Structure formats: C-alpha cells, structure tokens
Amino acid sequence: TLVRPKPLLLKLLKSVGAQKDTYTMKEVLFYLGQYIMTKRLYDEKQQHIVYCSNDLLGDLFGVPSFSVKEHRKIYTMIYRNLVVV
Ligand SMILES: CN1C(=O)[C@H](Cc2ccccc2)O[C@@H](c2ccc(Cl)cc2)[C@H]1c1ccc(Cl)cc1
C-alpha cells in the first residue's frame, strides 16, 4: 500500500531526511518515528507517551499527546494525513 502524505506530514517527514512524495506505510512510520525520537517528544519517564502540543505533529494529529502503544489510533490519525494510491 503506497500512500501520498498531505503537505503537513510531507513537511515533517522531509524534515528528518525523507525525499519522496510516495511511500509505503512502513516508511512513513519510520520517518514519523525518527521525527519523534529526534525531537524527543516522548517522556523520559514514560517513554511510550508523546507530547506534541504546539508542535507540527500536534497540528497534524489534532491531539496534544498520544501513546505509541495505541496502534489503531495512530493509524487513524496518520491516514487522515495521506491519500492511498
Ligand atoms: C515503528 N517505528 C519506527 O519505525 C521508528 C523507528 C526509528 C527510531 C529512531 C530513528 C529512526 C527510526 O520509530 C519507532 C518509535 C518512535 C518513537 C517512540 Cl516514542 C517509540 C518508537 C516506531 C514508531 C513510529 C511512529 C509512531 Cl507514531 C510510533 C512508533
């Protein structure tokens, strides 16, 4: 499943080295994750928790925080920022 990220997500992916306009979900998650890890949006004590308030990611996802353990929720928010090819 190749997807085409909407402007805002494309901007975040490319901010961590992404170069294409089209990607597989695994590549999206990889860059999305390198973005979180690079910025250190996660909590040191509760490392599965992400704080993205006032961030590009918070804008993207529409939430102030989320847990990486909630896969369906993460998939939902990501899907809202891409069109499936
Ligand atoms: C599946 N996956 C990844 O591919 C990347 C891996 C990565 C880490 C560092 C540098 C490059 C690539 O991120 C994973 C991950 C990110 C953040 C947290 Cl808090 C936990 C796992 C994890 C992940 C990516 C995105 C999201 Cl929203 C949740 C988890």
PDB file of C-alpha atoms and ligand atoms in Angstrom:
ATOM      1  CA  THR A   1       0.000   0.000   0.000  1.00  0.00           C
ATOM      2  CA  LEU A   2       1.652   3.146  -1.307  1.00  0.00           C
ATOM      3  CA  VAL A   3       0.380   6.383   0.130  1.00  0.00           C
ATOM      4  CA  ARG A   4       0.803  10.061  -0.652  1.00  0.00           C
ATOM      5  CA  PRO A   5       1.264  12.204   2.514  1.00  0.00           C
ATOM      6  CA  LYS A   6      -0.575  15.542   2.633  1.00  0.00           C
ATOM      7  CA  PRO A   7       1.540  18.758   2.731  1.00  0.00           C
ATOM      8  CA  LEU A   8       1.938  18.983   6.515  1.00  0.00           C
ATOM      9  CA  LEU A   9       3.024  15.355   7.028  1.00  0.00           C
ATOM     10  CA  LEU A  10       5.251  15.590   3.980  1.00  0.00           C
ATOM     11  CA  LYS A  11       6.922  18.575   5.601  1.00  0.00           C
ATOM     12  CA  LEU A  12       7.549  16.558   8.810  1.00  0.00           C
ATOM     13  CA  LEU A  13       8.856  13.510   7.021  1.00  0.00           C
ATOM     14  CA  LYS A  14      11.234  15.545   4.874  1.00  0.00           C
ATOM     15  CA  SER A  15      12.470  17.421   7.951  1.00  0.00           C
ATOM     16  CA  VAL A  16      14.155  14.184   9.001  1.00  0.00           C
ATOM     17  CA  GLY A  17      15.594  13.205   5.633  1.00  0.00           C
ATOM     18  CA  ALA A  18      12.631  11.865   3.641  1.00  0.00           C
ATOM     19  CA  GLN A  19      12.899  12.571  -0.092  1.00  0.00           C
ATOM     20  CA  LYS A  20       9.942  11.086  -1.974  1.00  0.00           C
ATOM     21  CA  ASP A  21       6.326  12.042  -2.431  1.00  0.00           C
ATOM     22  CA  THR A  22       5.151   8.448  -2.321  1.00  0.00           C
ATOM     23  CA  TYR A  23       5.845   5.941   0.457  1.00  0.00           C
ATOM     24  CA  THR A  24       4.795   2.618   1.993  1.00  0.00           C
ATOM     25  CA  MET A  25       3.293   2.798   5.482  1.00  0.00           C
ATOM     26  CA  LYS A  26       6.415   1.291   6.993  1.00  0.00           C
ATOM     27  CA  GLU A  27       8.485   4.137   5.593  1.00  0.00           C
ATOM     28  CA  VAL A  28       6.004   6.720   6.884  1.00  0.00           C
ATOM     29  CA  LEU A  29       6.173   5.262  10.377  1.00  0.00           C
ATOM     30  CA  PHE A  30       9.941   5.019  10.196  1.00  0.00           C
ATOM     31  CA  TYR A  31      10.347   8.747   9.415  1.00  0.00           C
ATOM     32  CA  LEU A  32       7.484   9.739  11.651  1.00  0.00           C
ATOM     33  CA  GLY A  33       9.259   7.852  14.421  1.00  0.00           C
ATOM     34  CA  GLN A  34      12.672   9.347  13.676  1.00  0.00           C
ATOM     35  CA  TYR A  35      10.991  12.736  13.944  1.00  0.00           C
ATOM     36  CA  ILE A  36       9.607  11.972  17.424  1.00  0.00           C
ATOM     37  CA  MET A  37      12.901  10.497  18.574  1.00  0.00           C
ATOM     38  CA  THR A  38      14.967  13.328  17.048  1.00  0.00           C
ATOM     39  CA  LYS A  39      12.856  15.988  18.703  1.00  0.00           C
ATOM     40  CA  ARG A  40      12.461  13.904  21.867  1.00  0.00           C
ATOM     41  CA  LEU A  41       8.729  14.471  22.052  1.00  0.00           C
ATOM     42  CA  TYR A  42       8.456  11.389  24.248  1.00  0.00           C
ATOM     43  CA  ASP A  43       8.503  11.452  28.073  1.00  0.00           C
ATOM     44  CA  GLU A  44      11.783  10.252  29.667  1.00  0.00           C
ATOM     45  CA  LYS A  45       9.939   8.530  32.475  1.00  0.00           C
ATOM     46  CA  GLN A  46       7.048   7.192  30.397  1.00  0.00           C
ATOM     47  CA  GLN A  47       8.741   6.633  27.065  1.00  0.00           C
ATOM     48  CA  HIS A  48       5.685   5.405  25.183  1.00  0.00           C
ATOM     49  CA  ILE A  49       3.957   8.738  25.807  1.00  0.00           C
ATOM     50  CA  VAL A  50       4.367  11.550  23.293  1.00  0.00           C
ATOM     51  CA  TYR A  51       3.898  15.277  23.938  1.00  0.00           C
ATOM     52  CA  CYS A  52       3.276  17.189  20.733  1.00  0.00           C
ATOM     53  CA  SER A  53       1.435  20.259  21.964  1.00  0.00           C
ATOM     54  CA  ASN A  54       2.258  23.373  19.915  1.00  0.00           C
ATOM     55  CA  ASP A  55       4.178  21.128  17.529  1.00  0.00           C
ATOM     56  CA  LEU A  56       3.793  20.348  13.819  1.00  0.00           C
ATOM     57  CA  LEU A  57       2.835  16.812  14.860  1.00  0.00           C
ATOM     58  CA  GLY A  58       0.201  18.094  17.261  1.00  0.00           C
ATOM     59  CA  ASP A  59      -1.203  20.125  14.372  1.00  0.00           C
ATOM     60  CA  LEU A  60      -1.133  17.055  12.109  1.00  0.00           C
ATOM     61  CA  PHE A  61      -2.750  14.623  14.524  1.00  0.00           C
ATOM     62  CA  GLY A  62      -5.111  17.093  16.153  1.00  0.00           C
ATOM     63  CA  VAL A  63      -4.136  15.887  19.671  1.00  0.00           C
ATOM     64  CA  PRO A  64      -1.815  17.273  22.404  1.00  0.00           C
ATOM     65  CA  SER A  65      -0.422  13.856  23.332  1.00  0.00           C
ATOM     66  CA  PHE A  66      -0.713  10.188  22.425  1.00  0.00           C
ATOM     67  CA  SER A  67       0.743   6.765  23.221  1.00  0.00           C
ATOM     68  CA  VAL A  68       2.762   4.748  20.716  1.00  0.00           C
ATOM     69  CA  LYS A  69       1.054   1.637  22.185  1.00  0.00           C
ATOM     70  CA  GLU A  70      -2.248   2.670  20.618  1.00  0.00           C
ATOM     71  CA  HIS A  71      -1.711   1.403  17.086  1.00  0.00           C
ATOM     72  CA  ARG A  72      -5.266   1.773  15.733  1.00  0.00           C
ATOM     73  CA  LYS A  73      -5.420   5.374  16.981  1.00  0.00           C
ATOM     74  CA  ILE A  74      -2.047   6.213  15.459  1.00  0.00           C
ATOM     75  CA  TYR A  75      -3.080   4.606  12.163  1.00  0.00           C
ATOM     76  CA  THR A  76      -6.285   6.625  12.173  1.00  0.00           C
ATOM     77  CA  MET A  77      -4.521   9.941  12.695  1.00  0.00           C
ATOM     78  CA  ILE A  78      -1.873   9.148  10.114  1.00  0.00           C
ATOM     79  CA  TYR A  79      -4.459   8.104   7.499  1.00  0.00           C
ATOM     80  CA  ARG A  80      -6.129  11.496   7.869  1.00  0.00           C
ATOM     81  CA  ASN A  81      -2.865  12.965   6.562  1.00  0.00           C
ATOM     82  CA  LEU A  82      -2.427  10.989   3.356  1.00  0.00           C
ATOM     83  CA  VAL A  83      -4.246   9.654   0.318  1.00  0.00           C
ATOM     84  CA  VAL A  84      -3.882   5.952  -0.523  1.00  0.00           C
ATOM     85  CA  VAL A  85      -2.519   5.453  -4.049  1.00  0.00           C
TER      86      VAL A  85
HETATM   87  C1  LIG B   1       7.602   1.767  14.054  1.00  0.00           C
HETATM   88  N1  LIG B   1       8.520   2.821  14.493  1.00  0.00           N
HETATM   89  C2  LIG B   1       9.569   3.269  13.701  1.00  0.00           C
HETATM   90  O1  LIG B   1       9.741   2.808  12.574  1.00  0.00           O
HETATM   91  C3  LIG B   1      10.556   4.380  14.239  1.00  0.00           C
HETATM   92  C4  LIG B   1      11.994   3.832  14.286  1.00  0.00           C
HETATM   93  C5  LIG B   1      13.108   4.863  14.408  1.00  0.00           C
HETATM   94  C6  LIG B   1      13.614   5.325  15.641  1.00  0.00           C
HETATM   95  C7  LIG B   1      14.658   6.276  15.664  1.00  0.00           C
HETATM   96  C8  LIG B   1      15.186   6.756  14.462  1.00  0.00           C
HETATM   97  C9  LIG B   1      14.687   6.296  13.247  1.00  0.00           C
HETATM   98  C10 LIG B   1      13.665   5.367  13.224  1.00  0.00           C
HETATM   99  O2  LIG B   1      10.120   4.894  15.476  1.00  0.00           O
HETATM  100  C11 LIG B   1       9.595   3.985  16.391  1.00  0.00           C
HETATM  101  C12 LIG B   1       9.364   4.710  17.666  1.00  0.00           C
HETATM  102  C13 LIG B   1       9.350   6.128  17.654  1.00  0.00           C
HETATM  103  C14 LIG B   1       9.052   6.838  18.826  1.00  0.00           C
HETATM  104  C15 LIG B   1       8.771   6.167  20.032  1.00  0.00           C
HETATM  105 CL1  LIG B   1       8.356   7.051  21.422  1.00  0.00          CL
HETATM  106  C16 LIG B   1       8.800   4.744  20.039  1.00  0.00           C
HETATM  107  C17 LIG B   1       9.095   4.014  18.870  1.00  0.00           C
HETATM  108  C18 LIG B   1       8.275   3.405  15.773  1.00  0.00           C
HETATM  109  C19 LIG B   1       7.094   4.357  15.673  1.00  0.00           C
HETATM  110  C20 LIG B   1       6.982   5.288  14.641  1.00  0.00           C
HETATM  111  C21 LIG B   1       5.918   6.176  14.637  1.00  0.00           C
HETATM  112  C22 LIG B   1       4.925   6.171  15.654  1.00  0.00           C
HETATM  113 CL2  LIG B   1       3.659   7.359  15.686  1.00  0.00          CL
HETATM  114  C23 LIG B   1       5.023   5.231  16.676  1.00  0.00           C
HETATM  115  C24 LIG B   1       6.104   4.320  16.691  1.00  0.00           C
END
